[PDB]
Amino acid sequence: ITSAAGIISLLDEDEPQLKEFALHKLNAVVNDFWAEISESVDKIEVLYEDEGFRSRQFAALVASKVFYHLGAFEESLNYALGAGDLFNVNDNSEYVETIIAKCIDHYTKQCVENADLPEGEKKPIDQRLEGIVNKMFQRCLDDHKYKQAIGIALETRRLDVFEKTILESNDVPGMLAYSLKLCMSLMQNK
């Protein structure tokens, strides 16, 4: 409650047991004290960087949370990628939703910019981003909403996942007519 300076202050101490409770407390109390922790964001970045820390992923998650709340969405996206597995895709939360959307957008932008390039100089894509997008593909399929998965596949230019979603369908000829229509419809690249 208030102040919220100590939980920060209990972080320099080189005792990797107080660091953990400080981390979880900052998580629990970030939503109302993101600003203050943002002033002290360098410390948590250092802590994440230190591989010795066991709970590095939780630190990366907290760093993404504070960066996201700040407004700087690129740093938040990078560190959210760094959060690894703890990025529970299945949280009906504002943060998770906005960050996944930002991720889909960046992946689409990279894919479009990379498609029209030689095989020599394809910009590498983060594996964490790829994992998150594939997870979102899996969620979309499992919900059974084929149309959304097809659309994300097209925008991202991914033809493999498009092919998957095309086959694993209870309305194969119907959604195949859908696909042809969309092809002759307002999509331009030749």
Binding site: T2, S3, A4, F33, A35, E36, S38, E39, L70, G71
Partner: peptide, 16 residues
């Protein structure tokens, strides 16, 4: 209302 000025200062300095 609760004379919490340092927190307010950070908040204002960070939002636009």
């Amino acid at each position: 209302h609760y004379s919490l000025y340092d927190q307010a200062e950070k908040l204002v300095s960070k939002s636009v």
